[PDB]
Every structure is written in structure tokens, then in C-alpha cells.
Write a protein that binds this DNA or RNA. Structure first.
Ligand SMILES: [K+]
Ligand SMILES: [K+]
Ligand SMILES: [Mg+2]
Ligand SMILES: [Mg+2]
Ligand SMILES: [Mg+2]
Ligand SMILES: [Mg+2]
Ligand SMILES: [Mg+2]
Ligand SMILES: [Mg+2]
Ligand SMILES: [Mg+2]
Ligand SMILES: [Mg+2]
Ligand SMILES: [Mg+2]
Ligand SMILES: [Mg+2]
Ligand SMILES: [Mg+2]
Ligand SMILES: [Mg+2]
Ligand SMILES: [Mg+2]
Ligand SMILES: [Mg+2]
Ligand SMILES: [Mg+2]
Ligand SMILES: [Mg+2]
Lengths: 206, 153, 118, 262
RNA sequence: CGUCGCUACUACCGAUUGGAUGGUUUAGUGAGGCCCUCGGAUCGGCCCCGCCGGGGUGCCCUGGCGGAGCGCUG
RNA sequence: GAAGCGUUUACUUUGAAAAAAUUAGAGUGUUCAAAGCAGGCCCGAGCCGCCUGGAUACCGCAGCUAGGAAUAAUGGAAUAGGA
RNA sequence: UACCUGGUUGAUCCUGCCAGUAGCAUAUGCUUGUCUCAAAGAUUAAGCCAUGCAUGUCUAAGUACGCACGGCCGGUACAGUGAAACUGCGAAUGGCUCAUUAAAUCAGUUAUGGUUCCUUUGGUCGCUCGCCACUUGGAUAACUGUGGUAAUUCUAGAGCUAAUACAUGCCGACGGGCGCUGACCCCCUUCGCGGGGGGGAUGCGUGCAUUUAUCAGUGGUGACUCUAGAUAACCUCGGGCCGAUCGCACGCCCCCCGUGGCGGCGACGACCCAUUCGAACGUCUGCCCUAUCAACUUUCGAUGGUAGUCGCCGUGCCUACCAUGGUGACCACGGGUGACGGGGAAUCAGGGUUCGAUUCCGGAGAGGGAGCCUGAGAAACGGCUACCACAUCCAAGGAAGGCAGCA
RNA sequence: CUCUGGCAUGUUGGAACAAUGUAGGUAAGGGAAGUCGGCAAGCCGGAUCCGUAACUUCGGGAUAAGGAUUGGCUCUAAGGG
């Protein structure tokens, strides 16, 4: 089948190499996963040595980490916006190792309020009252309240990040390998890397 | 130009740029840390790689490559590829019948890290064996010595 | 050639039968062999037709609905005997197991009990 | 080949097994075990060509099945078990105990030892590492691993190990001026004292060893195995005391032995 | 010494867009396996729940036929 | 006892590691030899068994190590950007 | 043993070849009394094959309701021997041949800090707080019974029955501890405020393995982006471990009792680590003849960079975007080989010249190609699928092939 | 094919749809057997990407020969002021 051998290539000087044996199993290749976005469909392929590789044909939920806040949450992927390898991979909405994707920011919003107690992602407020009126006040005691404003002076979010929290979607880069591990973990873009990819998306269409 | 001249974003994977820069620290300029390692075997990491800004995953000092195996030298021949040069090694092959030697050479394509900015054609370079970097590249440049120059008229 | 369920064509086709499909037993682990099978629809060109009565009628078919054959041998697992005999718990479970009697002419009569598992 | 080899030609067998060329075409082919097959003795040769207890392969099969052979404190029924180096071969029915140690010519020799000196065994630590929950582990020259070792044991040292428990009774540190034994190469089976350890980064270290007679020889660090504290060996050395003698003096030793016995 | 004449042998050129047998390939067709997306001949389970039933006391613990829940799902 | 060489090599010597078999070759009366890796000592019969061997050399070229520095190549300070 | 002799001339000195001479290695001719070793369808055809055999396997210790035997000792689950069959393992070793193959194979050297690994040996298996457990579920073999087919190691329907097959699934340790969340309460500088500390109800996660991101720096390297820690989380229904297994003697505790609880020796089993046997791709150097082969490679990956895919892993292995590179008179590229490489063999002053199909190591192949299942390990062929070439049986509807294994 | 501009089908109309003709098509299977002779007809054909021999006055032969693709729709890149 698909072969990963080096003997079918031309040698460095450009001469032709004659194979001295037929194809061997240990130098095989399998068809690409071509992971899509959708309901979870993960296939198991048995690999060298009796081990197990998880083919991830479709994912919809991933485990992405904020990083700057050490907050990792299991969130839902919306779509793929940029891919450094091929522009077609974005068009077919395929999840690869390094493509950047939009993820739902609700779990990070929930952690932010339950940790910082400052409105993030909100536009004008007084709209989800049955819970937000309780998280902000909590009628807490002297020390806990004193424990919350010591979490306030370091409480600040970059303008680029907080703007995306208004939109409800954060763009993040995958760090795992769907089609090998069967999962789509990654990290949220911040800083210069976030600015670099925003410029690339803007140059793509803007 | 800068280090972002392509379709992806370069960064040393061991470095976190976004270390929660808030009002307690002046922003900026918080100079990002640089990953660098001593490659061992007595070789001294160049100062350019200690404090430069280039990104090279195949660099012996600022990349994810380990030098192990044979250490050998050569002469730079061409420098018309990106981050990699070809060196020529001259040796003598002994022939028993004629009790005489025979001059032979082998060209080797080696990876040249951007830390060695001052590299011309004809210099002596010591290379160390690493994992296969390309189809025909298995050695990485460790030290550059000038070829009876260091002064240019 | 035997007829295979799901072929869905009158006639004979060749199938790459793997382990435990039908109409094929593998000679070694992982062996697959291509065999000829008959479709599941019946027509004139069939040697036999295996048919199973699912319900009784008005009377007994001669030589068929009479002289009922017993199950060759009873349950063995310590739970398959409890379901058959409504054993609750520790109601002399060992003795309730069916004891098959053996009767050969050139020997004394004797009954044989099986080893009960679990 | 398409898989593991499970045959060993008689010619391709290790030399120190001291097998001849006419009995058969194949060799014991030792099973996988604590020691590599090039530096191990299968039990079949040890009970047939060493002690002559068994005559053929099936005869050494019967003796192993009856379970009197006890290697390293455990009964072993494998006909081709790899014995290895300084392993205690105890046959309790006959009351003899053997410590498997190379002779002067780099060959394993029959070393009868006392029963109480068979209760312990020396071992060379090869890799030291820490496991999960921060538990330090230690693997020896055998495939034997122990947990919770004394933090002073480093790599290529020697640990005093007692049988039937597996604990570390004591240990020998690798240092200059320590008695050792060479376990591989040309100088295999030579008893001597460490004189110098030169090191080569990225390559194998070379150590220099001087024996009792003053002969100085070198070898690789992987062929060193310290069996004494300074000068005093911790095990009963075999006949010849692990001293190497050239072709000149074993000849006159035969003539002296022959003349005395004549 | 060479032409010429006779006889043998050896190669050479030569119309025949000669012929034969191998090898490497373009293009077209393309068996079969594998992967993916479907597909669902069949095969079970729950909802059994028309009923005789019923027990901590028509409020079923249920012994099983039986419609089949005209569904949920493997 | 830790660090570097006040060049870099070629060269030469040493050491390591370099499968066995084959070759040379040590021992051994196979009845001699080609071979083989065996074998030898006493027994007065209790010898309720003793002593050995299964060496060594060579293994080109390339790679590793430590000494020598004669021959051979290569460099240091010339706009001093020198020690 | 560092060796020559005949032949051009009327005769002589040479050049120079022809012939002689000795070995070994194939065939052949003649001859042949003894005895010890001993090669042997390689050379042409890796051309074609009838027949027979060449891979099977059970211990006390996975599963016995065959009467196929048999102790019965007689009122009991299974005495014991056990065919068959399920299960596990092996069948990827060995053996044969040398067609392909010219930096390829192979040899020496070195690396995997770039990977996988059945088995063996040693670690680990109460580390996880979370109405069956005195043991849960369904089928299927073997077996009885009805057949079909010209034929096959072809099988269907029907009826049973087990597991260390296939699934499901607890108790227990287990009392808690730790980190977050913190109702409140207490001691507080007290004073009209801040207070500096303690307890703590209630909820959320806790172990190993995986995939991420972050923090610090118990052991180890020449050098880790090593090992080990700490935090936030993930943990894939064709979905990891957290024993529903089997024998051997049989014993202790009896307060509570009196019918339970405890017990040793093993076997099997496992997620993971180490080890062993390896395997795989790599580093440097080394190969015969040919220039009536001097320029090759690059659309169709050629050389390199970036990001991915795939693979057990590193790599143009493949894809996308880029750069125009890479190799050559130190012989590239191409062609030939009556080329498998090497250890080695013959000849023997020294230097060399030929020969290595052939018993040891490595490779390759199983009529020619190609593609796969199972498995730790095969692109397997005494495994399967397809095509091509041969070729067997047939009732012409189909079925079955691979001696470069031993004969 | 159409707009501006022009015209009335070329010195007659109507009805039918025989032969023979003039002009134009199609034809199973075969494929030059027809004929003095492939006459006539038919095949091919544009563009893109490959790929092109003998011979030669070295310019050519050459669109040699031979092969693949070609629609519609939705996009994506590159080429400027
Ligand atoms: K008319
Ligand atoms: K014609
Ligand atoms: Mg049981
Ligand atoms: Mg050949
Ligand atoms: Mg050979
Ligand atoms: Mg093969
Ligand atoms: Mg297996
Ligand atoms: Mg095959
Ligand atoms: Mg008209
Ligand atoms: Mg008119
Ligand atoms: Mg007119
Ligand atoms: Mg026609
Ligand atoms: Mg036609
Ligand atoms: Mg004609
Ligand atoms: Mg005619
Ligand atoms: Mg015409
Ligand atoms: Mg023409
Ligand atoms: Mg189109």
C-alpha cells in the first residue's frame, strides 16, 4: 500500500535507485484522518507492536488552556479560521496539529467571574440577574472580600482578548494531533502570536 | 526583516511569552527570555545565539537537536541554501598494491545556524552528528574558524 | 451451495468470507477465503429448503409432532440450573443438578453427574 | 528474517562455552534472561560439559525437572536458563555450591564455594533513577531491580546483595585503588586494582588496572566490576587468583607439575 | 608484388518504413485489497403492560400465553 | 587532584574493542597420518576417585586511546584591527 | 625450491611470441585389492512436477454430562484414564536457492538524547475515598438428529452444554488526608475603624497510564525540551489498569460461640518500568568493467526552509507555500557483469593474480507482479485475494494449485 | 445573431409531393472488394499541457508522428495606479 520507504526516492546526486526488495510492512503508511468538525466519531487502528492509535474523524469538543491564567477548560470548537500549511484545509474545516480555531469562551467566562468577580464578556449588565447578582455580591465576610480585592490588582485582560469575549468566541491554536491521539487539545492565543494571526486573517479577507 | 516572514508563527516551545503582563510590571519592555543550552563536548555556545532573536528549531543551541556520535571537520564550499551549507572533506585512500595514496573527497550538506553570521566560503567548520534534519542532512555546524583571514582589505 | 442471509439476489455470488460470517469456517486465525454462496430468495433451482414451524395447528403431523426428543443434557452453570429449577439460594444446589443415567448391556447400570461451574 | 531467531548453530556459539564440532549442528541457544547470551552459561552445558552429571540433552532435562538446581535462591526448571556472572548455582541434594566466575583465560570455571558464602551475591548497579511518587530505583547488571536504595550508590558501583530477601546488605563504591574484575574483552577474567580512570565525553571511559604481579592493563568502563574494598576481595577468588600469565610460564608450570607427578 | 580465374571459410554493407526474443516506460482501460461516506438482509434489549394476576396489603411481589410498545435503542 | 593547550593534520609506537569456523601455531601416540579436542594417575578392589586442557598469534583500510615530534603540509604581528 | 627448456638463421647475439612444465577444479577416458574421512542438479532451465512426508502441541494446576474404558460401593456436583472439541501457544524458527541487487547488499565503526519489542528475569498489582460479590449475563463448540453437492480439510437448518473464549460488574481497604470553595464561630492592637491569626459546617477534584497548557528546580547526562515534583484540566462505547481464574497437602480461631473468620505452597493473569532476544532506520570508510556513457537531477521531489499529514519513530516519506538548489574528469549520470556481500579458497620469495552458487554471519526470493488478514513479530506464500503464464478434476454447474523443503 | 439604415426573395402565382434529375443529409455488418485511378465523399481540425523521427544546404523537417484536457457553478492565489 502507501509506503514510507526512502529507497523509492532519487539519491542525493540525482541518480536512480533500484529497490533490492519489495515493500515491507514496517514501512507502510495509512490514509490521512482528515478530521472534520461534527459529532464525535473516533476510529481505532491497530499499529506496530499491538498498540492502539485513535483516528479522530470528527470532533466537536476540545480541551483548550488559557495559559496566562493557568485555566484549562473543555470547550466546543466552532470553526477553523486559519491554517499555515494549506488554505484549502480551512475551506473544508479540517483540524490538524497547528491550525487555529474559534472556541466557545463560556467556560473561561464562568471561571473568570468565579475567580475574579469582575464583569467580563458582558455588554451592559443586569441581564442574567438570577445568578450574576449573587456572584458579584456573595455578601461575603471581611477576609474573603479582602481575599477578592487582592485578586483584583492583578485582574486585567488584554484589549484583544476582552474584545473576543464580547463576541463570545475565542480563537485558539490546537496543540495535539487529531488522527493520532484522537483529541483536539490546544491553547488560547495571546500577545504577539494573537496579533500575528489576526493580521494574517485580516490580510486573508478584510 | 524580523523573525515572522512566513505563514506560521515562530517561537521557542519552551518559552511562554504571555506571562500575565499586568500593571505590577512595566509594559514594556519586558524582554522575552531566550532558550539556550550547552551542547556539551567542550563546545562554547556563541554569544549571538545567547542573545539573538532568530528562531531555528534545528539550531544546536536554540533548537531541539542533540549532538551525539561523530564529530568531524570540513571546508565550506557553497552557501546557496537556506540555513544549510555544503562542506567538502578531503582525505587520502590507501592502495596496498601500489603502496601509495589516492586523494578522495565527500561533500556533506550540513545545517548552519543563524548564530554563525560571519561565515564565508573556504572556512573550516567542525560539525557534529545529529538526528536526520533533511533528506541528506545529518550534521550540524558547531564551530566556525576563519581561513587565514580575519582581516579584509 | 448453501444460501446466505442478506445476499439479496437469486443465484450464486462469490464472497470474501471472514471469520464467523456463515458458510465457512477458517482453517487458521485471520484467514479469509472467497466462497460461492446462494442468495436468500428461493426459487425453483434449490435442492432443499430448511423450514421451521413457529406455531402449532389443529392436529399432529405423523412422525413429526410426536415422540418429542429430550435435550441431550441439562444445564451446567450454577445459575443456569437455578433459572430452570427456581433455586433461590443454597437450597441443596448440587443435588438438584440433572443426573444422567447410563445403561450399557456389557456393564452394570450407573448414573453419571456433571461438574457444575461457578 | 521475519521474526526472532530461536536457533544457535554450534559453530556460532560463544567460545567460552567450549563446545566441540562433531556432536551436533546446533547449540543450547539460551533463553532470555538476566544476562546476555554471549556472556551466559546455559544450564545444559553446566551440568553436561562442566560437571559431567548428565550425558545428553534429555538427561539434563530429567535433573532439572526433579527440582534440585537452585540458581540465585530460586529453583529453575529451564534447561537453557542463562546463568551468567557470579550467580550462585546451589544443588542442595548434593550439598555443593557454585559461584560462576570467569577463570584466568576469560572462561567460566567451576568454583565450589561454602554454603554460608552462597547466601550473598555481588551485583553491579547499571542505571540509577527515580520513579513515580519520588521513589528511587536501582537496576543491576542482572535484570534485577530494587527500590529505596542508599542514596550514596551511584552508577557502575557494586552492591552487596543477600539471597532470599533481595535487599542491599552493603555496597562497594567505585573509586581509585579498589580491587576489581574485568568482565569483557581481551583482559576478561583479570583481577586487579583500579589505578586510573580516564574519561572521554561522548564516548566510553577507559580505566587502567594493575594486578598483584604489577602488570598494568586497560579496558572499558563497561567491563569493570568492583569485587573488593581496596585490596581485599569480597568473594572467594578462583584458582589462579585472577592473575594473567603469558605463554612463557604456564608451559614451565606444566613441566614442573608433570615432573612432580612423574 | 598485385589484378584476373577456380574452391572453401570469416566477418562487412545492403532495398526489405526486414524478422524474433528480452528490458524500461507514455497514454488508455483497469481486477483486487485497504480506508472513508453511506446502506441496513437480518439479530437482540427496554418500553411487557389486551390478561388472567395480585402483596409489602382497584394501590400488581408476579407464575406464563398473548396482542405488540406500531416507539426508544444496540 | 580539577581546567586549557602557548595551531591543525599527516606519520610512527602503545592500548582498547575487533564472532566462530578457516590459517599459523601450544599441548595431546587417532595404533601413525588426515583429523579430533581430547585426555593422564594410580586400584594393593573401595580409587566409597584424583590431576589437567579446551592456549597463543594474525585480523588489511576506516573509527577510538595514550606517548614521540625527526620528515611533510598548514597557520600567528605588516595600514598592526599585535601580545 | 626466489628454476626454466624446444622453435625464426648457413651459422651468431637479441626482441618476441608459440609450445613445453607444475599446481587446483569441472567433465571425460582406462583401470581399481584394503581402510579412515568426505563433495555431490550451483554452472545450461529462479525451467516443469505425479506421489508420500516435511508443524504441531496438555501439566496436579483453563473448559469433559462421548461409555470409549473404568474405581462404583449405593445415594453422591466432579474417582481416575480419557477420544473429540473450544481455548492458549507455535506455525515469522528451521530448510532450499542465488534470480534480482554496483554506496545498493555487505564488512568494520558508531547512534537511536529519533523508535517498537511475544517471551525471560526483576519491579508493580487495598497508593484511586467512588437487593449477585458466598460469584452476574448471553451464545457457541464438541455431541444427537435432518440433509445438499459429481467433487473439496465445503457446509445448512434443528436441539443441548461450559470457560482463563466472549461480555457485564461490585464489596473491600475506607478511618481519613491533601488542594480549592468557603456558612459561621473563636482569640486578637482593640477604640470610634482597620485588624494578625486560628478553627471550621457545605460542595468540587483527588492513584497509575494518555493529551494539552502552566510553575519551580529528588536524582542523571558531555549535552534533554531527562527523570521526579506542583497546578488547571482532558481521559476516545470497534472505549487502558485497578484479578468474577485453576491445583496441592490440609490446618488455626472459637469470646461472639457452633458457623463463620483466618490461614501456606504454587499456577494462570495483567496497565506500566527495567531486562533479555531482537528488529528497524541512520554516522564514517570501503566495490568489478566501461567515456564507441560528460554532463546528470528538477513538469511527475530534484536540493533546502516553514507548517502540517502519515509512520513505531528522525527525515520530501507525502501535502501546501516558498527558495533554486543538489551531484560531477578526485569520473557524476548511464550501460555491462557469465555480480548475492563477507568470513574465506587456489597459487605461493617479496609484491601480487584469480576464485568465493556452496554448510558460518547478513540480504533476497518462493512461477511473475501487486494487495492484505491474524499476530509482538509477515507485505508470510508447506496464509489469503486478484491478474498474467502454466496446469489438475468435472456429471461441464463448478472445484482445487505452487518441491529455489526431503526423497 | 442583432441595432441604425434598407428591402420584398430577384421578369409570375396556386394546388400536389410520381418517375428521372439538381443541391443537401443519414445508413446496420464489412471497409476500396468499386474504379483507369480513392474520382467523390468521409476522417482530421481551435486552444492548453506534454511529446516529436529519418534526413538536412543545420536554416529546416515540425502543427512531424503520437497522447491528455476542454462545460457549468462556487471560490482561492498571483500579476497594478
Ligand atoms: K402532382
Ligand atoms: K481500390
Ligand atoms: Mg471453574
Ligand atoms: Mg546474478
Ligand atoms: Mg557466497
Ligand atoms: Mg520472502
Ligand atoms: Mg501472540
Ligand atoms: Mg508473497
Ligand atoms: Mg426563394
Ligand atoms: Mg416574389
Ligand atoms: Mg433583376
Ligand atoms: Mg454504413
Ligand atoms: Mg459501420
Ligand atoms: Mg481493385
Ligand atoms: Mg474490379
Ligand atoms: Mg478529393
Ligand atoms: Mg514528415
Ligand atoms: Mg471543471
Amino acid at each position: 500500500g502507501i509506503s514510507r520507504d526512502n529507497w523509492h526516492k532519487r539519491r542525493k546526486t540525482g541518480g536512480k535507485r533500484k529497490p533490492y526488495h519489495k515493500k515491507r510492512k514496517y514501512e507502510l503508511g495509512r490514509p490521512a484522518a482528515n478530521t472534520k468538525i461534527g459529532p464525535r466519531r473516533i476510529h481505532t487502528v491497530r499499529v506496530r507492536g499491538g498498540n492502539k492509535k485513535y483516528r479522530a474523524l470528527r470532533l466537536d469538543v476540545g480541551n483548550f488552556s488559557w495559559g496566562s491564567e493557568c485555566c484549562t477548560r473543555k470547550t466546543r470548537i466552532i470553526d477553523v479560521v486559519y491554517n499555515a500549511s494549506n488554505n484549502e484545509l480551512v475551506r473544508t474545516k479540517t483540524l490538524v496539529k497547528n491550525c487555529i480555531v474559534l472556541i466557545d469562551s463560556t467556560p473561561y467566562r464562568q471561571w473568570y467571574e468565579s475567580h475574579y468577580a469582575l464583569p467580563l464578556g458582558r455588554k451592559k449588565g443586569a441581564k442574567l440577574t438570577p445568578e450574576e447578582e449573587e456572584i458579584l455580591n456573595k455578601k461575603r465576610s471581611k477576609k474573603i472580600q479582602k481575599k477578592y480585592d487582592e485578586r483584583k490588582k492583578n485582574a486585567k485582560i488584554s484589549s484583544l482578548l476582552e474584545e473576543q469575549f464580547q463576541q463570545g468566541k475565542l480563537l485558539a491554536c490546537i496543540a495535539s494531533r487529531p488522527g493520532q491521539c484522537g483529541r483536539a487539545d490546544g491553547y488560547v492565543l495571546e500577545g504577539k502570536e494573537l496579533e500575528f494571526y489576526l493580521r494574517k486573517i485580516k490580510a486573508r479577507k478584510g | 526583516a524580523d523573525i515572522q516572514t512566513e505563514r506560521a508563527y515562530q517561537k521557542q516551545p519552551t518559552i511562554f511569552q504571555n506571562k500575565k503582563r499586568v500593571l505590577l510590571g512595566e509594559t514594556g519592555k519586558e524582554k522575552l527570555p531566550r532558550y539556550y543550552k550547552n551542547i556539551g563536548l567542550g563546545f562554547k555556545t556563541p554569544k549571538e545565539a545567547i542573545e539573538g532573536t532568530y528562531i531555528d528549531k534545528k539550531c544546536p543551541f536554540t533548537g531541539n537537536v542533540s549532538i551525539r556520535g561523530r564529530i568531524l571537520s570540513g571546508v565550506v564550499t557553497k552557501m546557496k541554501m537556506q540555513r544549510t551549507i555544503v562542506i567538502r572533506r578531503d582525505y587520502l585512500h590507501y592502495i596496498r598494491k601500489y603502496n601509495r595514496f589516492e586523494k578522495r573527497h565527500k561533500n556533506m550538506s550540513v545545517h548552519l545556524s543563524p548564530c554563525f553570521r560571519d561565515v564565508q566560503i573556504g572556512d573550516i567548520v567542525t560539525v557534529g552528528e545529529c538526528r536526520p534534519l533533511s533528506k541528506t542532512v545529518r550534521f550540524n555546524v558547531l564551530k566556525v574558524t576563519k581561513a587565514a583571514g580575519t582581516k579584509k582589505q | 451451495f448453501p444460501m446466505k442471509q442478506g445476499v439479496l439476489t437469486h443465484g450464486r455470488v462469490r464472497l470474501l468470507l471472514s471469520k464467523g460470517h456463515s458458510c465457512y469456517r477458517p482453517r487458521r486465525t485471520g484467514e479469509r477465503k472467497r466462497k460461492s454462496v446462494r442468495g436468500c430468495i428461493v426459487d425453483a433451482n434449490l435442492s432443499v429448503l430448511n423450514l421451521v414451524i413457529v406455531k402449532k395447528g389443529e392436529k399432529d403431523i405423523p412422525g413429526l409432532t410426536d415422540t418429542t426428543v429430550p435435550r441431550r443434557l441439562g444445564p451446567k452453570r450454577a445459575s443456569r440450573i437455578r433459572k430452570l429449577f427456581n433455586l433461590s439460594k443454597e437450597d441443596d444446589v448440587r443435588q438438584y443438578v440433572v443426573r444422567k443415567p447410563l445403561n450399557k448391556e456389557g456393564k452394570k447400570p450407573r448414573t453419571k453427574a456433571p461438574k457444575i461451574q461457578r | 528474517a521475519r521474526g526472532p531467531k530461536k536457533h544457535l548453530k554450534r559453530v556460532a556459539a560463544p567460545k567460552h562455552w567450549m563446545l566441540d564440532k562433531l556432536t551436533g549442528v546446533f547449540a543450547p541457544r539460551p533463553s532470555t534472561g538476566p544476562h546476555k547470551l554471549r556472556e551466559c552459561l546455559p544450564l545444559i552445558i553446566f551440568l553436561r560439559n562442566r560437571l559431567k552429571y548428565a550425558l545428553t540433552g534429555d538427561e539434563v532435562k530429567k535433573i532439572c525437572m526433579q527440582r534440585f538446581i537452585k540458581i540465585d535462591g530460586k529453583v529453575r526448571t529451564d534447561i537453557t536458563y542463562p546463568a551468567g556472572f557470579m550467580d550462585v548455582i546451589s544443588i542442595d541434594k548434593t550439598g555443593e555450591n557454585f559461584r560462576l566466575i570467569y577463570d584466568t583465560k576469560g572462561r567460566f570455571a567451576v568454583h565450589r564455594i561454602t554454603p554460608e558464602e552462597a547466601k550473598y551475591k555481588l551485583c553491579k548497579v547499571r542505571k540509577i533513577f527515580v520513579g513515580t511518587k519520588g521513589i528511587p530505583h536501582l537496576v543491576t547488571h542482572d535484570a534485577r531491580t530494587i527500590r529505596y536504595p542508599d542514596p550514596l550508590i551511584k552508577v557502575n558501583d557494586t552492591i552487596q546483595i543477600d539471597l532470599e530477601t533481595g535487599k542491599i546488605t552493603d555496597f562497594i563504591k567505585f573509586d581509585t585503588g579498589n580491587l576489581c574484575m574485568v568482565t569483557g574483552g581481551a583482559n576478561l577474567g583479570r583481577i586487579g586494582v583500579i589505578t586510573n580512570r580516564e574519561r572521554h565525553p561522548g564516548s566510553f571511559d577507559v580505566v587502567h588496572v594493575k594486578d598483584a604481579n604489577g602488570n598494568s592493563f586497560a579496558t572499558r568502563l563497561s567491563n569493570i566490576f568492583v569485587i573488593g574494598k581496596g585490596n581485599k576481595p569480597w568473594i572467594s577468588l578462583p584458582r589462579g587468583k585472577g592473575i594473567r600469565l603469558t605463554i612463557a610460564e604456564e608451559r614451565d608450570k606444566r613441566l614442573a607439575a608433570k615432573q612432580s607427578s612423574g
